[PDB]
From a paper:
Ribosome is a molecular machine that translates genomic information into the amino acid sequence. While the large ribosomal subunit functions only as a part of a whole ribosome, participating in the elongation of a protein chain, the small subunit has extra functions, being responsible for the initiation of translation and for the recycling of ribosomes after termination. We report a high-resolution (2.3–2.5 Å) cryo-EM reconstruction of the [name] (common wheat) 40S ribosomal subunit. By implementing the multibody refinement algorithm, we obtained cryo-EM reconstructions of both the head and body domains with nominal resolutions of 2.55 Å and 2.34 Å, respectively, extended to 2.0–2.2 Å in the most stable internal regions.
The more ambiguous situation arose in the case of very short protein eL41, virtually a peptide, which is situated at the interface side, binding both the large and small ribosomal subunits. We were unable to find even a roughly adequate sequence within the Triticum genomes, neither by description nor by homology search. Such a lacuna in the data forced us to use a rice sequence as a substitute that fitted perfectly in the map and should not be much different in the closely related plant. We succeeded in proving the acetylation of only one N-methionine in the protein eS21. In addition, as in the case of tomato ribosome structure, an extra density in the backbone of Asp137 in ribosomal protein uS11 indicates its conversion to isoaspartate (isoAsp) via dehydration followed by hydrolysis. For instance, 2′-O of Um428 in human 18S rRNA is methylated, while corresponding ribose in wheat (U384) remains unmodified, therefore being able to form an H-bond with the OH-group of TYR7 in plant-specific 5′-end of uS4 protein. This binding provides a sharp kink in the protein chain that ensures the perfect stacking interaction between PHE6 and the U384 base. Interestingly, the fourth latent coordinate is not related to the mobility of the head domain but describes the motion of the ES6d 18S rRNA expansion segment, sometimes referred as a “right foot”. Unlike the first three coordinates describing mobility of the head domain, the major part of this motion is not a rotation around a certain vector but basically a rigid-body 11 Å shift of a significant part of the rRNA chain, coupled with only 1.5° turn. Analysis of the intermediate density maps describing the transition along the fourth coordinate revealed that the C-terminus of ribosomal protein eS6 remains bound to the ES6d segment, and its very long α-helix can act like a spring to provide this unusual motion.
Numbering used by the authors:
A (entry chain X): 2 to 141
B (entry chain W): 2 to 130
C (entry chain b): 2 to 84
D (entry chain a): 2 to 99
E (entry chain N): 2 to 142
Amino acid sequence: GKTRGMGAGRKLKTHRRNQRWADKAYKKSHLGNEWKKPFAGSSHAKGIVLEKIGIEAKQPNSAIRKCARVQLVKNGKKIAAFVPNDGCLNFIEENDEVLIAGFGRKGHAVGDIPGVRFKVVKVSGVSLLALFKEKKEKPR
Amino acid sequence: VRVSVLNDALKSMYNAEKRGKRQVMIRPSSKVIIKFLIVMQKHGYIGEFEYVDDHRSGKIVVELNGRLNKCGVISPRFDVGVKEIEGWTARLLPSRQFGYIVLTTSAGIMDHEEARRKNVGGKVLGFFY
Amino acid sequence: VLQNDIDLLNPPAELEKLKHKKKRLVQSPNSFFMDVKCQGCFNITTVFSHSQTVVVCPGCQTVLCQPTGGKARLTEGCSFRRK
Amino acid sequence: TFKRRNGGRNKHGRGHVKYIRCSNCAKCCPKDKAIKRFLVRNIVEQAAVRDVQEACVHDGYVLPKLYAKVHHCVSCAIHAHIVRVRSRENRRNREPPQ
Amino acid sequence: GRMHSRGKGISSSALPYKRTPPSWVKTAVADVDELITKAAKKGQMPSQIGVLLRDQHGIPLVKSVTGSKILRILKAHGLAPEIPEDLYFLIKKAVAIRKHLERNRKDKDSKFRLILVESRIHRLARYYKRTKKLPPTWKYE
RNA sequence: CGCGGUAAUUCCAGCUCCAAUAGCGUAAUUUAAGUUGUUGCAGUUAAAAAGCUCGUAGUUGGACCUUGGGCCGCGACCCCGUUACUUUGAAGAAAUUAGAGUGCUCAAAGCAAGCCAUCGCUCUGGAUACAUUAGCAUGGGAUAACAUCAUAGGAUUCCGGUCCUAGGGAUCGGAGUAAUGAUUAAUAGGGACAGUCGGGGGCAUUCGUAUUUCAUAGUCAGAGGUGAAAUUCUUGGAUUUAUGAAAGACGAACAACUGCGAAAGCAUUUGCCAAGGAUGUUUUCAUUAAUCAAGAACGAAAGUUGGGGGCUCGAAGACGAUCAGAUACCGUCCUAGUCUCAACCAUAAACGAUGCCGACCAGGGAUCGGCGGAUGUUGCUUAGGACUCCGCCGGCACCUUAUGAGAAAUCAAAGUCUUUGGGUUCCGGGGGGAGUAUGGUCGCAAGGCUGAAACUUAAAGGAAUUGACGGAAGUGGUGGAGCGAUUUGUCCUUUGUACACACCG
RNA sequence: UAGGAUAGGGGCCUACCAUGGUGGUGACGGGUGACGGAGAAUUAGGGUUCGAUUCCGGAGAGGGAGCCUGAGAAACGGCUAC
Ligand SMILES: [K+]
Ligand SMILES: [K+]
Ligand SMILES: [K+]
Ligand SMILES: [K+]
Ligand SMILES: [K+]
Ligand SMILES: [K+]
Ligand SMILES: [K+]
Ligand SMILES: [Mg+2]
Ligand SMILES: [Mg+2]
Ligand SMILES: [Mg+2]
Ligand SMILES: [Mg+2]
Ligand SMILES: [Mg+2]
Ligand SMILES: [Mg+2]
Ligand SMILES: [Mg+2]
Ligand SMILES: [Mg+2]
Ligand SMILES: [Mg+2]
Ligand SMILES: [Mg+2]
Ligand SMILES: [Mg+2]
Ligand SMILES: [Mg+2]
Ligand SMILES: [Mg+2]
Ligand SMILES: [Mg+2]
Ligand SMILES: [Mg+2]
Ligand SMILES: [Mg+2]
Ligand SMILES: [Mg+2]
Ligand SMILES: [Mg+2]
Ligand SMILES: [Mg+2]
Ligand SMILES: [Mg+2]
Ligand SMILES: [Mg+2]
Ligand SMILES: [Mg+2]
Ligand SMILES: [Mg+2]
Ligand SMILES: [Mg+2]
Ligand SMILES: [Zn+2]
């Protein structure tokens, strides 16, 4: 059983403190390892397109996901960022500013794309959605 | 060891009532158990009970009338002010219409409604309904 | 039997004798003291039924009782009466 | 899933039980778990009985028997058909052969 | 439950409800008291004194007749033991086991039982020091 | 989760429809999460009870002491120990929050305002509640904690002594007084005693056949081993037979749904030594107790260091087979080891995969230990033993049953749980990485204890059902059972399964 | 203990003396992407997380240090030095 005594407040508090480290979410929050991530705790980061690459999907699916290799500016960390919206790889060029965001699963890989948790959202200051919908044009 | 004689008394009574027994023997006896039993009898949840003197910790033989759904103790005996009686009754009682929380107060051992009537707080012994 | 068929306050006295000494309504010992009458000499010399000591007649005669696991064994050729 | 309440042996209120050696394969099996049979046979096959009872100098001579308590591991007892796999309900029956 | 074993025995004596002497008891109170004093004078402990008064005399229970307990009576007349009797017996058991182990080194079972006996000695000595029936600096070695 | 391989409800578009709407989409934290659990989770098999016991701190601790009664009248009446807790009061800034009033046109707000119109008035309003803990004060004393708790050596009158001071005060004694002052003995615990019981332990001692070796004697061509062989031994007598001796292990049968032990474990005799449970008790103490961080004791087997021993068996090794291969399974010879002493090691599926203490709640028949009662027969020496029967306590267990619980298997505890709280220790939080790295500590070493992260992944896992497979054995209805898939009916079946594309797995 | 110093208590400092003081009720150390609080978000209840920012308190004026004036500053929209 568990301790129930009126004078056992310290026992209960210390036990809860020690057991909270078993929870994955608690330990992810309070370990400090999220500051060693490429984004270092920020929702978005900017980076330089180093080279356009195509990485194969998982086993059941057969596709080339056509991501981008991005070197961040805040820390110089190289990441792979997915480019959604069919045809948007042609808006991506080497040595071009891009705003990266998370792939929506908090550093966990998403879908059939292995090892990618980052998507390109903005290129050269123009959103990829605007370029897909032809609402704006990429500056020369 | 026997830590709470009240818990053994109430749990034996609960088991006997569930079993359909019309008499339950309580050992040991104590003033708190006789005081809890008097509250129970006053609200009509038990019948006659008899203290048997054996020149030791006594015995109580209680008549059961089938009106008990559950009786139990709260351990620890948490401090309950008059204002926290509402929260305790919501936690432990089936409805705001029936059921009783038994408190030990400096004014005596009493049900929560009687504790409200004299505005006296204390510690929770248990409950029955 | 079924306890609904009995009264826990007035148990049948026949079945109370067979209960363990501590499991009765009011616990009582099943031992007793006895006026042991020897063969010829008076020497009443009350003995505990469950005596753990070898009781000897006052005139340093033969032993009168023998300790056992339970009730003491009176020596051969001795009577007794409960007290 | 626990197949048997006794765990395939006979061990209550004790720790270690000395093992025996299987009569067939010399396997180490606990004495309480091994299948044990007391075989009381005759030194003379039912057939040779008459021929032997005939070639006897002493007219009154009961033919001596053989008494042997045979120990078997589970694998050899099943292979030799000393015990056979039983249905779930019938396993709880410990009665000797009817 | 046994303090140092899993045994759950309930064998014990059951004092009668009647706390007054039976009518067949006729020994005067001073008589039983001076009998207790002689008994302690040879060296008997209160348990043995009670046993002898029970099986060799017409005294079922001392408390019923006199109104006091044997140890209290002995303390009144200044014959109570220095070390309390239960602690005395536990220390006797401990020294017996220690002698046996001084002869028998391989007896690991007896070593385990000695550890248990000394644990009982420390418990009872702590209680007696708290109740001031032992010297405040009384020590067992 | 999935979609896309030519008929795409899922991509690119058009049309149409849907949600929200001047907004809506996308990329830490709360909720969801009873997936951190105090309320309120788990730990037999899903993750999880330390191998076992002792033990300090901590946590938790049996019952008992002023009650009744009536009267007046819900108060009252009558017959110089603390603390927690509770009650009331004072405080606890404002803003924020809750909330009274008030038609900023509403509202979010604001703290304004309103009045037939007024040289003014409504003293206009600008409330109130909340505010842990700690502090201060008031009443209460049930519950509980701590401190005491038979030199009470209690106190009170009279008679004294000494000192100080306008008779009084302080101090030390004698003599008088009172119900002289101690709860009971827990189906709590410790201790004592008694007759027992046990394969509990240590030491010494005895015995037993087998096996190996040796000695003697007989005999002569095989023996050994396997599915079959071969390695191997053998006319210098193998194997076999008889006798005798020595050595080292091993304690069959009896032997159990039996016993003892904290666990590990413990089975030849006798003797000694200390220890232990249960039972019995009108013996004793009187709460001395439960569980436990720290700290200890023991702890199978293997393993390590050294001595002895070294029968048998036997890792490694060698060889012989089998084999497609065979570093294995099978066979032969064997090293370390297996045995013992001293010192280490501290790990097991160390399992009941179920920590310990306590209470309650079904029935039944066996069995072991003790005790009580009743028996009528003993190759018996009146008791007593041996049987028989009836009880009580304690123990290992077993059978049936659900009124219970459970995911079920199943469990009489794994029950008395959303009607959730007896006490306490350890311990789990999807699957891997991982009991890995590193640090520390212990160990001669082997290793033990403590013990991550990065990263990766959508399951892994449990129980049960149907089918299929096995180099395993020999179709509705209605009703009933099951939470259910299902099943019964239908009497290939049973069984195992990690397969279900179903073993061509 | 005695001084000195300060607006004043105080090992605040000095001289002498003693050996103390804290700690599993966690001292000491380390981390904090830590100023504290009033409060904020979410909340059946219990709770979880946040609290740089307008109110209160504290601290700093590139980093240290030292001062003058003044009732009040170790001031920085004052001075002196590194
Ligand atoms: K078996
Ligand atoms: K006893
Ligand atoms: K029994
Ligand atoms: K049907
Ligand atoms: K000063
Ligand atoms: K000083
Ligand atoms: K000035
Ligand atoms: Mg074992
Ligand atoms: Mg479309
Ligand atoms: Mg869970
Ligand atoms: Mg498993
Ligand atoms: Mg498991
Ligand atoms: Mg109590
Ligand atoms: Mg282990
Ligand atoms: Mg385990
Ligand atoms: Mg265990
Ligand atoms: Mg619960
Ligand atoms: Mg996990
Ligand atoms: Mg049906
Ligand atoms: Mg299986
Ligand atoms: Mg000074
Ligand atoms: Mg900071
Ligand atoms: Mg702030
Ligand atoms: Mg900052
Ligand atoms: Mg600002
Ligand atoms: Mg400020
Ligand atoms: Mg400043
Ligand atoms: Mg700056
Ligand atoms: Mg400055
Ligand atoms: Mg400036
Ligand atoms: Mg300024
Ligand atoms: Zn076999």
